[PDB]
Amino acid sequence: MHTAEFLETEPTEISSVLAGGYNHPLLRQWQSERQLTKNMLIFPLFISD
Amino acid sequence: MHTAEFLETEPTEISSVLAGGYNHPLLRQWQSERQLTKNMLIFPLFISD
Numbered sequence A, B: 001m002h003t004a005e006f007l008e009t010e011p012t013e014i015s016s017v018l019a020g021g022y023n024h025p026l027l028r029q030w031q032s033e034r035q036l037t038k039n040m041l042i043f044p045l046f047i048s049d
Helices: A025-030 B025-030
Strands: none
16 A cells, blocks of 8 residues: 655754744845835826827 | 135036935935934943842
8 A cells, every 4th residue: 555655854954944033924025135125115107299 | 815716617417416315304314224213222330239
């Protein structure tokens, strides 16, 4: 009978662990190199004669 | 009589002109690599027993 196979793993390498930096909603913001603000927007205007 | 002296100047070099990038209040913001937001603040708390 086909059964789930689990390979022999080695101890986790710290260099592999990145999850600690984006496990929370706030972290999603901290992880952004730049946050979206109102004064960053430029609305186009088509003026007619 | 001591009078104001003005030296002979050469035509302005474009590479000298940087003023066009921060002459307006909004430009002061555009010139910032990162803007200050509320979710960037971390308030310290001293809990007593």
